[model samples]
Target: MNYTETVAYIHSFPRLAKTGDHRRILTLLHALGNPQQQGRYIHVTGTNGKGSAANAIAHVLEASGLTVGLYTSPFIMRFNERIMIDHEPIPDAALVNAVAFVRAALERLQQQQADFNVTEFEFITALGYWYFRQRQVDVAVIEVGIGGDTDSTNVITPVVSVLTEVALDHQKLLGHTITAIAKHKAGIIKRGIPVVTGNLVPDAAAVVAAKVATTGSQWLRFDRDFSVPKAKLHGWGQRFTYEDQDGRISDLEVPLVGDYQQRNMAIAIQTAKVYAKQTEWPLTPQNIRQGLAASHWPARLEKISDTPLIVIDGAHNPDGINGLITALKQLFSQPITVIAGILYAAMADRLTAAFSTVYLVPVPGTPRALRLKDSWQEALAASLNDVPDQPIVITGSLYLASAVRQTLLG
Candidate 1:
């Protein structure tokens, strides 16, 4: 099948609730010869910063002369954005072929009357491992598609597991409280494998520490073991010093903008160091510096235009919104104009309270999402024209961010 047809076929698979056994993914991977087992892996999972952490680590590995495979979720602009090799997405032909391989395996399992069904994310996860194996990657940086323990990508026993800060998101499926969410995220902590976390919440960190102890995994806390003791806002990104138990790497600059990214980079730097020890790969200060400089995760405080000053971020949760606001204040001096719609109802008032002027828009693709009678695209464009002096930010949910990005860039 062609690339377009392949995407449709994969999407046709049902997204089963996160309540089943992990056997479906395991069975499917087994049929594909367990491609995930072919290479080493660095598994990353958290409520926020998974994409940033994964991308940063992948870039470091690539800079250090390793063939790296990066797999992330919820593509911003294109489906191919989810899978990458050496900072490039999977080729169109390669994706089509991988989907074909996965489809055939699924059909075989059905013919054999397998008791379990594969979900859409399960199929996609299998496809990424298959492609990574085909490319003979030295290390595959895989991000969890959901809660760490139950996520389809959890099938692999990674060399090092990285956790970004734990926040209350996906509460209905994961859990309601910080401790409950931490339990699900800490599920990625495999027995005897080292874990590095940026979780700063006292309650959440304690849960993760307990899990690490239970699993016999060495734990590295953000403030205790490593930190960005100093960081300054640069032109588009920032300059910072990342220090860990090993030493300190100073004058590091990241291309991605945001104050929170300094914390994310610290988590990634520690993960890379641990992976270097496990794999005996050469990860030097130069590699870290270049990797941070080259790393780019789109839709997180991304600047699309300069004339009207447009920035877009996918800060869906309350924690994410807080980070976005802090970053905006650091970068812009003028009063900000926000174009957004709140997905989590409780956060609506809090989000609206931060900006000078707010233009609410419906989140595309989800049922019951808010929508205004007037077209958001037309309204947003007019606002950009009228307020050329003021900074405009299009954010809220990733779905809304991606839609606005398509409108602005298209």
Candidate 2:
């Protein structure tokens, strides 16, 4: 199939928000010979920082002369961004072939009325597994598409599990309370696995602790031993030092441009320490510093231009919103304008409240999402007329932000 056809066919699957068991994904993988079983996994799950943590781990693994597979959600810049190997996106030929194969299997399943929950997201997951297995990756980092317990990626028992901060982002599906969401996130932890957590609330930390206890999983939490030291953002990147019980590993620089990345970098480093120690992998202080300094994750508080100083980020939830707010305060000069939009499951009020001036535009091509009260047709309609041309931000949903960035730059 061609690229357009591949995307269109995958999109035909129902991306439902309903909570479910992994039986459907299991059945599909079984019929396809369970490609995910071919390699060890590093699973990262939570409401926020999953992408950053996964990318960081993948980068470090790649730097250690290992071929790494990465599966992340909600693509930015390109559809291929969701499925990566060796810190690069899947090639077109492989992506197209995998989509065609899944499409054929889906048709047969539909004909027999057999079990399947092949969402567009699930199709991508299948493709990533197939691609990774085909390439013989040394390790794969799977980021949960949603809540962990029943996410498709949960099929693999991970060598290391990292839970980034749990927050009130998916209240409708996960639950209304922090404890409930934390429990859902903790579901990704498997029996006898070591887990790593970063900067969680007390309630959320308790929930995770209870789950780990039942699973007999060893865990390390942030602030108990791991702490990130503040550092300066020099010319091309930001640098920070993390201290643990052992000693302080200083001068960790991430090519990703954001102050929020300091926290993300710390989580990745701590998780790496656990993995290296458990497996007897010789990841020294120098190796860790080199990995962080070379790591790159796109579109997180990225300054794309200088004339008007426009920045783009993928802050789709309230926790992500807070991170972006912190980055803006630390890096950019104030009086910023936002070309903001919200997603279907987003906490719109909380997200929007972070910005000083917002352009209240609705995103395109997504189903079941919220639209602005005022349409884009009514441009001169009092809400967006007064904003200055200096430093406008096109950010919120990654999809929406990418669209705005494309339109503006093109």
Candidate 3:
């Protein structure tokens, strides 16, 4: 327990982002020997593309060579981007020895059930399955921190299980409707595995088609069983076309810059082509178009800054700031200045006439926020000197786009 007492002893337990039971995270992964039953998962969830379809299905199973492992959530600037692999991060002395081996298995399961509890996301899902089983990862991708039946990473049983949309954003904790948040995002269906969703609506696709017929699984519906027909914009990238029920891949680029990322890159290319045919691996369509053109999910539509033509989008709620105002009105029509570090301006009168100037910055620990001085880098440097390049847009709080992307990339 070295790194600041291993992140304050893994935030000393209860930071419950409540959903249901996981039997105290399966008794803290059965005193830390389970390690999520050793690798091979693809369990995403939704209410806005679970971290861009689990970072484009862990960059298409690490571009089909494997060794994946990528657990995400609320970590934009730090916390080792909530543990990753294949693409680095998680090496602060291996997150202080995986939080000192999951805090010594939560003190030997709290002396055999001395009121067992664990939930800073089930102790970071048992410290990312003990650092992806001490980095012997071959596939992890897990991303359900909030809803999904008993989501402490739904006690792993996945080879495929995407589910990218289902809105009404965490209605006061997964309830206020859309079939109770599509029954906790179809509780990560498992029985026969094969899940993959994305375009869900029609009452959350009839509660995920009755939980994929009570978990017999194989449900793939995005435009009813696979789509993305074709997307456009190809400069700061995107260029889709996916189809399914067996074939079609066509020019898939996606260097991420939203139009809701071509449905999270066709739900990460049909969840990496059904998890590479249930783990037999060797996938193509040019390794799913070079893993959807080299995947990355930093602040959604993030073009951090290019001489003040800044952009940052971690669209925090209101149906993701109305789909980041239709992907910034389908990638700007010039005169656009939107710096909303929200707390008021309920959608700033819905972005007053869709952009040209709508500023306000305050959301740094809100209890008494509003034009607060010691942060938000001086109201985003006085709203970028009242619109300098005139083409800025840093949507709402992912803690104000990771504090204006650390002051516009420092």
Candidate 4:
């Protein structure tokens, strides 16, 4: 399809963020001949840090002179951020072609079936795989869009799997506690596949360890396998060392600007160690360092300016909020004006516990999303009464942030 048709087809799919099974996407891929399996995959998943880890993995792989395809979700600024190669976005021409290909495959499937509503994420996954295969990417680092087990991208078996920390985020979908969440997250660990996980709570770690033992998958924990720099450098970046299983790799200098990014780097390095087969081009420690330091995935604690030191991170849960609190304590020199929005805010819980200065925004379609109904001001006042009238920050899903950002820009 042409560009117009491509966009129209993309717009035709459902838009809300909801978690669902991959059965439809898998069938669609089968019909399309399963492009995801056409190339090697490094499947990465977790409650937090998946995108950063995937980006680091892909970066190091690409630095070794092989073309890489990187896929992640919830683009903060541009849709092109969803699919990219070697730091460049999938070209418009390529995206248009990919959409055309998937649209055709979808129509053929519908012709055979009575009813099918392809979610937007499924379409994007299909399009990204096809485009990556057509481009002949040496490696595709796929990030699970949500919970790993049933995410559309989980259809392909990964050569290596990395699970970032597990926590209580998607409670309504993944269950109520960390253990329940880890079970769902551990679904990506295939039989005989080695998995690496960052620091998980004791209960959560036990869940993953049990699964790894059952599956006979080698497991590496963050603090045990490698070391990441604790403090962010004044003007530089985080640094860390990866213990190459082969006993040949060296330390790294990753330049990401967050204290938490250190954990992501360690995860990527451990994944590379597990999947280090002889490729036509293989990554080196120097390259891995460069890749981690240079990756450009944005909107995760991105500093848009210095005067106000405005930062926007798509940290939507309590786990994420904690990470943000840790990062702020590490990086900022003064009090921050945090903008927060939530699907719903439980009283005195994860969503509100981290911030002292918070501005409330609506999540759209929910009572909390409507400030008039939920009285966001009252919630903020209750949660953040001790900030001494500091500037309020607006935080929530990207929809609320975008609305407030646009209004402010206007």
Cα deviation of 1 in candidate 4 (Å)?
5.8
Model 3 agreement with the true structure over 1-410: per-residue lDDT tens digits: 57777777777666654446677778778788887887788888887778887887788778778888788888877777788888687887879877877777788777887877676767877888878887789888888877788767888888888888877767888888888878887888878888888777789888878778887788877777778777888777777788888878876787787677787778788888888888777787877788767886777778877787777877775666887787777777778767676665667777765775666666666665332244446645776787677777777788778766765564
After superposing candidate 4, which stretches have Cα over 4 Å from the reference? 1-5, 14-23, 229-232, 241-251, 278-281, 306-310, 334-410
lDDT of 2 by residue, 81-180 (tens): 7888877887777888888776677667767875456766666787778778888887788899777887777788888899988888788788899998
Q: Could you give candidate 1's per-residue lDDT for residues 79-198 as a string of tens digits?
A: 998898897888899888888888888888888975656888888898899989988888899999877888888888899999997877678888889888888888889999999988
Per-residue C-alpha lDDT of model 4 across residues 41-77, encoded as one tens digit per residue: 8888887788788887887777767688889876654
- Model 2 misplaced stretches (Cα beyond 4 Å): 15-20, 106-117, 235-237, 256-260, 316-326, 333-338, 342-362, 365-389, 407-410
**How large is the C-alpha RMSD of every model relative to the true structure?**
2.3, 4.2, 18.2, 5.3
Each prediction's TM-score against the native?
A: 0.92, 0.84, 0.34, 0.79
Give the higher-TM-score candidate: 2 or 4. Answer: 2
Which 10-residue window of candidate 4 scores lowest in summed lDDT? 368-377
Candidate 3, clashing residue pairs? 345-348
**Clash pairs of candidate 2?**
none
Full-model lDDT for every candidate: 0.83, 0.74, 0.77, 0.70
Clashing pairs in 1: none
Winner by TM-score between candidate 3 and candidate 1: 1
Better of 3 and 4 by lDDT: 3
Residue-pair clashes per prediction, in order, are 0, 0, 1, 11
